[PDB]
Design a binder for this molecule. Structure first.
Ligand code: MET
Length: 526
């Protein structure tokens, strides 16, 4: 097989990192984490998009060199992402000398294949989105001065007219084939309604894309077109190539890049198994990216998943990812974002709701359940008991726990992480209802033979749910497993998705004094 290759979009370094970037990368991170938990080879990629007019003109407005500015902001992105405790394998920068090489090579391939020609683009362009737009996608709006101007219907930013001699990619010639690709691979774009957006857009027709810009326009802050120093490679063709680059970089233990391989196969990563993106950058990944790859005779990605947030921009609920993490907890925060947000963001991100979920699901449902099946009160010998005979209620719960991995697996592979969490927690609420009925606290006295059966199922339930919640709560899953005393070997691998991987007689971990797994926040805000 292959290295499971998951990516996030590489973010413009025009401004400090914020929740949006963190969320996108968090999705990339989780998908990665779950595949490692299945014991697969993983390579999760993230990074910054440093070239372009947008970034150049942000660096100019802060009275600083593009090189110095992008290094600065890039550093802030890395710091942020380190604080968030992702398990990302590499942070790429499009200023990397080796990335530049891949871009020049891809361009040459495109030119050699006959799909790049010298023409003009005369039309609208949004600098903030670095996006060509047709007149149907612009409208009337207000310049930040206050004067009347034209803006993008998509994003809302100011659009400007551009008339330039540019190099043009023959995107038009790839309509028939992109349509074949969407139809033949109906999981390739997720969620389904966005997939239908891409097909209708492409069905309507595709014009040629301008893959270069005049040197001056971009303030010489971009990759030169091979064989034409007066032009620069479109920031987006540059940016997209990051995926091919990352697939070709050998990385040391520091996470520093040490070599660029000649051919993507050497590292067994390309094409991406999943590109995590946001809704604002769909066309670049679903239309251009493959059209480029089809031209160069490279393989197409397997899945693009486009979540409900804007990868860029400040909208809505002011969140500092790190200040909320320090406030409510890191794993708790990540859980909250992944649980509360589905594919259309009808999400309630208020403090009230965060507290309600942390208290509700993380403390009451998961938390209380862990503390019960490890309590000296209930689990008197601090060990995994041997179950006696199973009742029909016993087996009904066992069935749920046995089916959870199959279900959770599918949801992660769509991927729909929200559905995966709900799936797991459905099984947790069930376990709690079982314990409530069985009153194990009473059985300690009455029927110890029975309690063995009840404790074992509860323990195994907790174990398997926690295993499946480990890509969401990576730190707290370790705290859980320590409490249950699960050996390191049983914390990973599809072998341990099975009911009863941990044998009876396994001892629980040391009970720490005044220990709380998820501490309850104050429900009463006023
Ligand atoms: C190849 S993904 C590029 C995304 C772009 N830099 C953004 O921040 O939206």
């Amino acid at each position: 097989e292959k290295v499971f290759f998951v990516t996030s979009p590489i973010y413009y370094v025009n401004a400090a990192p914020h929740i949006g970037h963190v969320y996108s990368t968090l999705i990339t991170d989780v998908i990665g984490r779950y595949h490692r938990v299945k014991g697969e080879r993983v390579f999760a990629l993230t990074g910054t998009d440093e070239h372009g007019q947008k970034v150049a003109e942000a660096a100019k407005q802060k009275q600083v060199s593009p090189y110095d500015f992008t290094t600065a902001v890039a550093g802030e992105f890395k710091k942020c992402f380190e604080q968030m405790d992702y398990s990302i394998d590499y942070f790429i920068r499009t200023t990397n000398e080796q990335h530049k090489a891949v871009v020049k090579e891809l361009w040459t391939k495109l030119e050699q294949k006959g799909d790049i020609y010298l023409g003009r683009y005369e039309g609208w362009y949004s600098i903030s989105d670095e996006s060509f737009l047709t007149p149907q996608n612009i409208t009337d709006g207000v310049d930040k001065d206050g004067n009347p101007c034209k803006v993008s219907l998509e994003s809302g930013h100011v659009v400007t007219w551009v008339s330039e001699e540019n190099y043009m990619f023959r995107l038009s010639a790839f309509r028939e084939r992109l349509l074949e690709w969407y139809h033949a691979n109906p999981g390739c774009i997720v969620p389904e309604f966005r997939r239908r957006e891409v097909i209708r857009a492409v069905e309507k027709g595709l014009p040629d894309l301008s893959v270069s810009r005049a040197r001056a326009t971009l303030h010489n802050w971009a990759i030169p077109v091979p064989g034409n120093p007066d032009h620069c490679v479109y920031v987006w063709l540059d940016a997209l190539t990051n995926y091919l680059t990352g697939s070709r970089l050998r990385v040391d233990e520091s996470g520093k890049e040490v070599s660029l391989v000649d051919d993507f196969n050497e590292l067994e990563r390309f094409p991406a198994d999943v590109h995590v993106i946001g809704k604002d950058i769909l066309k670049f990944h679903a239309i251009y990216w493959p059209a480029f790859l089809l031209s160069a005779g490279l393989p197409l990605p397997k899945k693009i998943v486009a979540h409900g947030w804007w990868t860029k921009d400040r909208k809505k609920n002011v969140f500092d990812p790190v200040e909320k993490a320090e406030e409510f907890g890191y794993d708790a925060l990540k859980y909250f974002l992944l649980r509360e947000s589905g594919f259309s963001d009808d999400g309630d991100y208020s403090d009230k709701n965060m507290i309600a979920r942390l208290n509700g699901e993380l403390a009451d449902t998961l938390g209380n359940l862990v503390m019960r099946c490890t309590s000296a009160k209930i689990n008197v010998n601090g060990e995994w008991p041997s179950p006696a005979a199973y009742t029909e209620e016993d087996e009904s719960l066992i069935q749920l726990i046995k089916d959870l991995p199959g279900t959770a697996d599918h949801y992660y592979l769509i991927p729909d992480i929200q559905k995966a969490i709900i799936a797991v927690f459905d099984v947790l609420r069930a376990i709690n209802a079982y314990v409530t009925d069985m009153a194990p606290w009473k059985l300690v006295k009455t029927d110890p033979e029975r309690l063995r059966t009840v404790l074992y199922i509860t323990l195994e339930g907790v174990r398997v749910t926690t295993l499946l919640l480990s890509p969401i709560l990576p730190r707290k899953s370790v705290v859980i497993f320590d409490m249950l005393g699960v050996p390191e070997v049983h914390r990973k691998g599809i072998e341990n998705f099975e009911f009863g991987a941990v044998p009876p007689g396994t001892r629980l971990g040391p009970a720490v004094e005044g220990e709380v797994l998820f501490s309850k926040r104050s429900t009463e805000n006023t």
